[PDB]
């Protein structure tokens, strides 16, 4: 159907015709399988629902303390792979910035791209620092298995290699299931995660040293999805600093070479940007039609080039751009 | 006396012990001593090193013990990692891999430069 | 071929890379029971790496070992050699034999009440486990499985699979000092058989390789938290007849454990009781003693 | 006999002697450390952690260096 | 312990400074040894006389 499902599995409203209905899966995860067993709690929320409520079920509802620091972590949604002792610093500077500020990581969820490598980061971790997952309902692998008002239901780490659904990471403490009532399709967390990252900016914090609670935001990799969520980070109110990793490919990489070679935003030569334009049409793939036109937002990013912190690879852990950012963002 | 210390503390407890158990009244007057428990004992029926701890204080005490568990087995593995037959040991593994990574390098980047002689020559 | 079968031919090759890479993926049909039989066959002939990747796929230990899941680990003889016969003999004949005889729960307890000495008392030779032998040879299950499994790992053995169960589960300290006191009293039976010095020299080790276990986890406990270090020394553990890590260490006679800071600290604490006037004692104690009035000008800790 | 009172140009003379000898003892000691055989292992072991992730880049985009460089020959 | 080796790097008079920071870490362990205190507490001490010596 339109949503993705078999025609006799039924049982927004524009093509799908939806009805809101209570909630009924939310509970406790047993994570059997994987190495070590982690229980992890979930609740399906719909796309729609108000933020104040999130954060009251957040802190009472969850027994989860407010962090010091909100590291997202924002990338490409299909499986890349990355340099080995690359993927390692990161993860160690990850690991080493979440147990010094006691931050919640908002990882993806669902264990493709940038998600299995926040996951592979947790094992070098192995033994506090939640990992709050906001991944679509509709994509989870065994959404039967999900179904239970309290219960501890048994979630293996079974991922058929050719289903479309995808299996939740085993490593992550907790999770968030966003039901917008469709299968397989991504798009509805997205705006969910981005008002519940800014409900959680609102909250000020107990030492009040910037601004409530601060947010960190680390890109790898990335399409223009990232670049999109790039500009509306950086020209938010407050706005909230981009910390991109490079020696990834994909957007991050667009990202750097331009900020290495950018000085005031928009004073890049005509040899280096009509290289960028190739390498954005040819390099990763896109349409040189709307090559000026992610060059026109890339511009628009680069308008604010004082919070946007890049990580140059060459000891040197990200937890260093990671804490200069937390400076940098905090006023 | 390379066991001296360790031999007296281990009297210690011995004597601690023992000397806890003991009545308060010295050995001529433990009979009085022993008329009061016996007294306490029968009013009690016919009419310090064993905290016998809660349930909740139980399970605190067993997440200690697995997070010392736990940073144990991660410094002696540092420690393994960081020692220096180890080191020799992955440092000698990494120089075997690198001398067939460059002679690979070196055999085929003759072809690649003389490829390219050639492409120059033939321009 | 099917997954078990698989998995039994990799546990021959003793190769567990390849059960891990190709047995335990993606699509497999495990049938009912054939992961606690697997885990069985791998605990019987010394497997820790398989009994590792088994528990890494989640066998359920606290519901695999039953009574008879035990009894059949103790009767087992697919593995190393081990003294138990030997100890079975000498109980049964001290209680007072074929060769086809099965080790009963209750007579390996009163091994480990042989062998521990002194006030100890096994849970297996209590009353409530002896009507629950009675009338069966989640009431048969253990509720703490990795202590058994401890126990069984020491009294046949099976050092690195002692080593694995002393990994895993809770009250790791007792453990630890259970199995050298365990290690060292069957090393003393040994001796006293004047048997093979390897064999007697391996236990030995095994004690003194667990007494320094005991000892960096208490030096780990020391480094964390000096008060959850005394609570974890002083707490009474139901599941070795009541007794303490010190008397457990006591028991062991083992100089290296009482020989630390905090144990040091804690028995300085208990030796004079509720009083602070403790600079350059004795004296001050003599002349309370001599001196009735001489108490009130003493230091004396709050409650 | 032993307790010589300096004057205050010979005592800024024995105190910048002996800012001088901390200097230098402090030099001797990190060159110490930093000849000792275990310092040297660990910045060896540290260095060839570098170079064969250097050299694995080197070698896997060498090889597309090569490819491209033998379809540029095949195409002329 | 660090904060003293750091203050020892600085300023003047400094053999003068280490034998009186000798002395009176020594001092200390013995006043903590004549309490019979904790072996650690006192053992450190007497680590930082030596070390100061």
């Not at chain 2, 016996?38 to 809660?54: A, D, V």
């Not at chain 3, 009894?71 to 190393?80: A, K």
């Not at chain 3, 100089?255 to 800071?261: E, G, K, L, S, V």
């Amino acid at each position: 159907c339109c949503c993705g499902r078999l025609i006799g599995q039924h049982v927004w409203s524009i093509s799908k015709h939806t009805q809101l209905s209570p909630t009924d899966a939310f509970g406790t995860i047993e994570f059997q399988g994987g190495g070590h067993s982690n229980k992890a709690m979930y609740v399906r929320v719909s796309f729609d629902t108000k933020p104040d409520l999130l954060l009251h079920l957040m802190t009472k509802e969850w027994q989860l303390e407010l962090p010091k620091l909100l590291i997202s972590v924002h990338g490409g949604l299909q499986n890349f792979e990355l340099q080995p002792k690359l993927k390692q610093v990161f993860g160690k500077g990850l690991i080493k910035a979440a147990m010094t500020t006691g931050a919640w990581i908002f990882t993806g969820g669902v264990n493709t791209g940038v998600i299995r490598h926040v996951g592979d980061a947790l094992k070098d971790h192995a033994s506090k620092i939640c990992t709050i997952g906001i991944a679509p309902w509709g994509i989870v692998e065994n959404q039967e298995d999900l179904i239970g008002r309290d219960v501890v239901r048994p979630y293996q780490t079974m991922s058929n290699p050719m289903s479309k659904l995808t299996v939740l990471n085993s490593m992550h403490s907790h999770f968030i299931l966003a039901d917008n009532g469709t299968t397989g399709k991504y798009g509805a967390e997205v705006k969910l995660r981005r008002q519940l990252e800014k409900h959680i900016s609102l909250q000020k914090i107990n030492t009040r040293i910037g601004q409530g609670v601060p947010v960190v935001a680390l890109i790898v990799e990335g399409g223009p999805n990232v670049i999109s969520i790039v500009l509306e980070y950086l020209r938010d109110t407050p706005p909230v600093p981009v910390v991109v990793c490079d020696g990834s490919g994909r957007a991050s990489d667009i990202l750097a070479f331009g900020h290495k070679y950018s000085e005031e935003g928009g004073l890049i030569n005509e040899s280096l940007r009509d290289q960028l334009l190739v390498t954005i049409q040819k390099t990763f793939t896109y349409t040189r039609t709307q090559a000026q036109h992610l060059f026109i937002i890339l511009m628009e990013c680069m308008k604010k080039k004082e919070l946007i912190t890049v990580f140059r690879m060459g000891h040197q852990d990200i937890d260093l751009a990671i804490l200069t950012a937390l400076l940098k963002g905090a006023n | 006396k390379s066991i001296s210390n360790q031999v007296w503390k281990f009297q210690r407890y011995q004597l601690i012990m023992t000397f806890h158990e003991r009545p308060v009244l010295p050995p001529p007057l433990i009979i009085f001593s022993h008329m009061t428990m016996i007294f306490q004992h029968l009013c009690c029926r016919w009419r310090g090193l064993k905290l016998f701890i809660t349930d909740d204080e139980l399970k605190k005490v067993h997440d200690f013990e697995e997070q010392c568990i736990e940073e144990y087995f991660r410094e002696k593995d540092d420690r393994f990692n960081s020692s220096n037959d180890e080191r020799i040991r992955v440092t000698s593994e990494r120089v075997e891999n690198m001398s067939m990574r460059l002679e690979e390098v070196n055999e085929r980047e003759h072809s690649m430069k003389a490829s390219l002689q050639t492409v120059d020559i033939r321009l | 071929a099917s997954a078990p079968d698989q998995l039994s031919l990799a546990l021959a090759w003793n190769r567990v890379d390849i059960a891990r890479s190709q047995i335990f993926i993606y699509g497999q049909q495990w049938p009912v029971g054939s992961l606690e039989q697997a885990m069985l066959d791998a605990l019987v002939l010394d497997r820790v790496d398989f009994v590792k990747l088994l528990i890494e796929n989640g066998v359920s230990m606290h519901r695999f070992l039953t009574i008879s899941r035990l009894e059949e680990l103790y009767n087992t003889r697919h593995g190393p050699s081990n003294t138990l016969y030997h100890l079975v003999r000498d109980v049964k004949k001290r209680e007072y034999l074929p060769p086809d005889y099965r080790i009963s729960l209750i007579d390996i307890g009163l091994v480990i009440e042989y062998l521990m000495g002194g006030a100890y008392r096994c849970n297996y030779t209590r009353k409530r486990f002896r009507t629950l032998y009675h009338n069966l040879f989640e009431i048969n299950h253990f509720p703490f499985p990795f202590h058994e499994l401890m126990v069984w790992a020491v009294l046949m053995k099976r050092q690195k699979m002692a080593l694995f169960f002393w990994q895993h589960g809770e009250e790791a300290m007792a453990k630890a000092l259970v199995a050298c006191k365990l290690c060292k009293a069957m090393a003393h039976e040994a001796s006293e058989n004047d048997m093979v010095d390897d064999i007697s020299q391996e236990l030995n080790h095994n004690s003194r390789d667990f007494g320094q276990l005991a000892v960096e986890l208490l030096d780990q406990s020391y480094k964390q938290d000096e008060q959850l270090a005394m609570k974890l020394l002083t707490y009474e553990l139901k599941n070795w007849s009541n007794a303490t890590c010190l008397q457990l260490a006591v028991a062991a006679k083992h100089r290296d454990f009482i020989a630390h800071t905090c144990s040091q600290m804690l028995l300085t604490d208990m030796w004079m009781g509720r009083l602070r006037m403790r600079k350059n004692s004795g004296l001050k104690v003599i002349l309370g003693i001599l001196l009735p009035p001489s108490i009130l000008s003493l230091e004396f800790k709050n409650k």
